[PDB]
Design an enzyme around this catalytic site. Structure first.
Site, short mmCIF file in Angstrom:
data_model
loop_
_atom_site.label_atom_id
_atom_site.label_comp_id
_atom_site.label_asym_id
_atom_site.label_seq_id
_atom_site.Cartn_x
_atom_site.Cartn_y
_atom_site.Cartn_z
N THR A 15 -72.12 36.67 -72.52
CA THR A 15 -71.90 35.86 -73.40
C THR A 15 -71.04 34.78 -72.53
O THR A 15 -70.71 34.81 -71.44
CB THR A 15 -70.53 36.55 -74.29
OG1 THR A 15 -70.76 35.38 -75.38
CG2 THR A 15 -69.39 36.85 -73.77
N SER A 84 -72.28 39.36 -77.49
CA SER A 84 -71.43 38.31 -78.13
C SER A 84 -72.21 37.01 -78.23
O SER A 84 -73.08 36.84 -79.56
CB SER A 84 -70.27 38.12 -77.39
OG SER A 84 -69.25 37.24 -77.43
N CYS A 85 -71.94 36.00 -77.78
CA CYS A 85 -72.58 34.72 -78.17
C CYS A 85 -74.38 34.61 -77.49
O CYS A 85 -74.95 33.85 -78.02
CB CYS A 85 -71.93 33.43 -77.51
SG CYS A 85 -70.24 33.36 -78.23
N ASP A 212 -64.47 46.83 -82.97
CA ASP A 212 -64.50 45.56 -82.28
C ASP A 212 -63.39 44.62 -82.71
O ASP A 212 -63.37 44.29 -83.75
CB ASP A 212 -65.98 44.99 -82.36
CG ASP A 212 -66.19 43.46 -81.62
OD1 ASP A 212 -65.29 42.95 -81.26
OD2 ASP A 212 -67.30 43.36 -81.17
N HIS A 240 -65.11 45.89 -78.26
CA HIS A 240 -66.17 44.85 -77.79
C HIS A 240 -67.11 44.78 -76.62
O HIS A 240 -68.42 44.50 -76.86
CB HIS A 240 -65.55 43.48 -78.16
CG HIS A 240 -66.31 42.24 -77.81
ND1 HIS A 240 -67.35 41.67 -78.72
CD2 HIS A 240 -66.31 41.50 -76.71
CE1 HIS A 240 -67.96 40.70 -78.26
NE2 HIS A 240 -67.47 40.42 -76.99
N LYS A 241 -66.48 45.31 -75.67
CA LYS A 241 -67.22 45.54 -74.50
C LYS A 241 -67.80 47.02 -74.42
O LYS A 241 -67.57 48.02 -73.50
CB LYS A 241 -66.64 45.33 -73.16
CG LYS A 241 -66.31 43.88 -73.31
CD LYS A 241 -67.31 42.80 -73.15
CE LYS A 241 -66.71 41.54 -73.06
NZ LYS A 241 -67.68 40.38 -73.49
#
Lengths: 262, 258, 258, 262
Positions: A15, A84-85, A212, A240-241
């Site tokens: 990301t 993510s992005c 997350d 999140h990771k």
């Protein structure tokens, strides 16, 4: 009745602000299983020599992936995993190389659609998580006069929101190699919508955890409801990771994607 | 038990990342830890072709030290080629340095030129296996040789015993680097008042596969440290394979030199 | 008579020094004058091998413009290759620019790629006489060609009519430079909303011995300026050989565009 | 009775912060007369790529001149002309290459001696002119821990003190190319005294004007009294930059030095 097991070529996409380094635990786990794994740094990320102020769009940011895909042998296809992005990198890439893509896997990721603007899940994300705590922002003017907002992710946000459950060695590493990044939201807003024959046609697997602390459950569920994935895998726990906190679990889900689509 | 401010210095081609296990371990003992990217290393934005000497490469360390508040002293810990960054630093800021720690590192002296231990290292290990070399002309006309470290060399010689996650991280963030050997060959020797006067602690393992035990032993005989600590086993990257052993030695160095 | 803020932009290999006669002349008329060194030009500390495109070369101008206070507009005056710096600048900061002035300069358009007038210039003048060329690979892998301008070329083609003191100054501070032709060949064309919309004044002499009269005339036909002023005589460096004539035209541009 | 006229090789040395560019009017005037003229930028001056913070002594600063002199053909000798602080470059150079030097010409310059420390005329100068008006100072630590003071000469001091009578085109030029510089006074203070067989033996011609507004008349006369030059030439009028305000007069004096010594 007949059982299938498939080896595949994964292309792993970090990301914004991060680099190929975030995949340093999942890339070996996948290769233990016999897969081929490419982890690329995108423009101005990881140890890429370009600076973010020389980059003018999320498309330009995506250059390493598109060059990579231009170079895949005829008849070779990859599964692109983006965190993510990086769902926007998968959508930019699928409108240029739909036949080289076996499936897109969104890992606690933006899930762009074709119906709305490219910037639409970015707006929704920022709406669900409007405070980036100690993150600092900056601006530059791009090649056509648009002002681009960049960010240096703050260390508390890193600790608590993105790397919540990661080890201290993984949290220190992130701090040692994190770069500036940009959502390029306003140029994504001016961007043509992703296509139905490119991006709209690829298979799409959505991996996420409700633990997350930055791409939050209401947002994630909004995205799933907004653009139904071909398959959804919810990992219990972690953070999140997930490629750091649930590396093996993610590699086992990814084996399943390779069997279904690669 | 004394808490100290440690400044960790990676070797050419690597970056502050190599210390990502040792920085939290030290901090668990209440130490302050600063880990710097040297010029054109880790995520430093400069490219190696714009760096013209090992002293310019050392700039992040010298700026850091230039700004350390009055009365503060640090223990500089340097791995592999970073023994040259400690000696350049100690000559400019001797009063800011409580001690230098060489971690499977070059141990420069005052009697020979700055390139002397680099000469001896290359003599002990002349084949960099799959490493590639490149050259550029620096601003003064000297030809600088850079290297891109080969992955077999990384796997088998530098990160020999490291986990697969660590070796893979190394491949993902390794940058080009240079010994600037020939500019060091032309550099004034390290002074007896600066570098010659600092406390020197040498940490090593005989299981190191690039800084081999007879070169390490020649270094210790050539310029006897104040203390030599030998860790059994591990590999060249003891801050990754023996992180708690080096954190413990470093506690002994904070106790002894503050 | 309107006083304006003029930003003077030298061509590749030169620096803000080329404007040392024109800056006081303009200031005698009450104008504000800013003369910038582009990256790796005049006394800028960067070397040309660290610059990777003509947009990175333009950085001093774009930073300047980035910081101009709100509501302030400038007239950018660019000589020779600096017509490319005006067009890069006008695309990013159109509202800060009252007008662009091309002084024996490239006049880029919107219809062809950014390298189109560079192609045509080289076609009109393909022999740079004693100029030397060098190459380096930029950070993305493209091969960049640099040049060191030859002194016969400086004497006879660029500074043809200049005094000996001026020609000698030129030899004393000339730096390497690059057209970055091939990166410009890959660059998005200049936009109609930015560069296409600004006021454009073209100043030239048919006595210019490097930007020859038929190339200059082709440029004017290819992208008709709002005004074309032709100075009789002088040479390529009209800001040195016809300083008061260009100061007078520039007064006409401040009057017309503020 | 017998008249002599000599063509010579002048090596022109600028002062700290300036570069070869200050000689852009005198170099052609001298070549009109048939002399060979080299004008060198010293380390970190004019367009030399090195930065002052990489330079550690006035000796290191003098490298371009010493390399040049190392390379002169056997049997070739030059007249070194140094302005303002460049008298120290002439003394550093004469202790290394006394047989390549026909004469040293000090042009509104420091006139070092062998009796006192190398820094001694620098102390006297700063005593005679203690206020550098709008000049800014900075510091760095050199290769052995000495702190070096650098300066960015202020524009009023430039206008009024160094370039008093120069044209506006010459004053604007100076502003366009001026660099940082350092006296390295404290390392000159630790430096071995200049030698009697090197520097003490070269011929020394002292050109000055009493209209100089930075190396003032009492200082200049102090230096002349302190270390008697072989010849003194006082130019009426002009300013500190006599190679700009009295170019032809300086070229005619320099013809006379070539006839006497070259």
């Amino acid at each position: 009745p007949i059982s299938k097991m498939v080896t595949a070529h994964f292309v792993l996409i970090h990301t914004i602000c991060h680099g190929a380094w975030i995949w340093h635990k999942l890339k070996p786990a996948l290769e233990r299983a016999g897969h081929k794994v490419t982890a690329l740094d995108m423009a101005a990320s990881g140890i890429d020599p370009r600076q973010i102020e020389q980059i003018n769009s999320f498309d330009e940011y995506s250059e390493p992936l598109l060059t990579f895909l231009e170079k895949l042998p005829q008849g070779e296809k990859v599964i692109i995993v983006g965190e993510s992005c990086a769902g926007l990198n998968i959508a930019i890439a699928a409108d240029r190389y739909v036949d080289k893509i076996a499936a897109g896997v969104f890992h606690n990721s933006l899930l762009p659609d074709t119906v709305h603007s490219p910037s639409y899940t970015v707006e929704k994300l920022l709406e669900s998580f409007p405070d980036a705590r100690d993150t600092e922002y900056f601006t530059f003017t791009n090649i056509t006069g648009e002002t681009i907002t960049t960010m240096k992710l703050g260390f508390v946000l890193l600790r608590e929101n993105l790397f919540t459950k990661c080890t201290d060695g993984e949290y220190e590493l992130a701090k040692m190699v994190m770069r500036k990044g940009s959502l390029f939201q306003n140029v994504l807003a001016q961007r043509p919508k992703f296509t139905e024959k490119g991006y709209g046609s690829i298979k799409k697997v959505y991996i996420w955890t409700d633990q997350d602390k930055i791409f939050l459950p209401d947002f994630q569920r909004w995205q799933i409801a907004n653009y139904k994935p071909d398959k959804v895998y919810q990992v219990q726990g972690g953070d999140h990771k997930l490629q750091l906190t649930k590396t093996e679990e993610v590699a086992h889900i990814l084996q399943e994607v390779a069997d279904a689509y690669a």
